[PDB]
Amino acid sequence: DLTDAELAADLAADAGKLLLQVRAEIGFDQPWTLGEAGDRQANSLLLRRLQAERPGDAVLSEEAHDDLARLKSDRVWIIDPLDGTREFSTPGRDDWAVHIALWRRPEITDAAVALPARGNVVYRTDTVTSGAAPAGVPGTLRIAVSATRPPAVLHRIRQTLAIQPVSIGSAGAKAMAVIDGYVDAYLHAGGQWEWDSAAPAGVMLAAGMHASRLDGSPLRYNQLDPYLPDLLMCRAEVAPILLGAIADAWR
Numbered sequence: 001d002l003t004d005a006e007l008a009a010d011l012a013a014d015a016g017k018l019l020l021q022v023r024a025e026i027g028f029d030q031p032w033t034l035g036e037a038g039d040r041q042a043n044s045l046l047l048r049r050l051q052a053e054r055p056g057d058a059v060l061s062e063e064a065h066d067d068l069a070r071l072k073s074d075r076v077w078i079i080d081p082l083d084g085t086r087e088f089s090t091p092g093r094d095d096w097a098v099h100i101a102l103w104r105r106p107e108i109t110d111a112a113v114a115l116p117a118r119g120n121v122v123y124r125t126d127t128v129t130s131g132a133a134p135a136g137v138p139g140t141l142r143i144a145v146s147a148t149r150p151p152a153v154l155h156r157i158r159q160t161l162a163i164q165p166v167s168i169g170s171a172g173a174k175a176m177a178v179i180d181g182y183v184d185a186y187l188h189a190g191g192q193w194e195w196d197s198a199a200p201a202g203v204m205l206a207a208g209m210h211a212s213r214l215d216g217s218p219l220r221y222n223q224l225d226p227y228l229p230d231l232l233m234c235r236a237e238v239a240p241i242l243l244g245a246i247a248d249a250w251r
């Protein structure tokens, strides 16, 4: 008998525990095998528990076929059973996450992000707080970006703004680094899926921070095509500066 937020948190933790077990059982000799097992077993747990505890809700999971029944539903769980599979599959890495979000017909109303290797901490929309003090040196930004080849937009905004990119695996880990104050912002372009941003966005917004498309428009979920090209998540104070610079870069 859990609230949707309590369930999101419990699902995230439980999947987190299972992933930690898989990591210990399978080990790191074959990264691909380890990653596949984590993806598959975390997915199986989450679908089993959502069917048992929310039999009426639709589920959109990275690791399951998408039958689009969710388009007619008022309640949809949007989940990534293991975000940062590569990182998970690498010895010593703690930048991987479980994403559990509930979409209600519309916004992400309840959500949780677990970082299992970080003491299985679970960030949740019903307990995350709005006390964020501006961290770091004035006039300079630390921005979390993925461990891939940088988009054209960040190159351009770095001409005008002092920025140190911080390489972090996993969308969830990057978003929670914003929450923690380890970085000022998390910026992504070039493509992503709804389950990558739904739970982090829910938590971000619940913390009183900013989550939008790069052009400032709201993140939209439970779309036919669950692909979201770009995003910006950041401290509230930082949003005008970055949205401004992004818009200025389109000149």
Ligand SMILES: [Ca+2]
Binding pocket: 062, 080, 081, 082, 083, 084, 085
């Ligand atoms: Ca995944």
Ligand SMILES: [Ca+2]
Binding pocket: 080, 082, 083, 084, 171, 195, 196
């Ligand atoms: Ca992912």
Ligand code: NA
Binding pocket: 044, 045, 048
């Ligand atoms: Na199963």
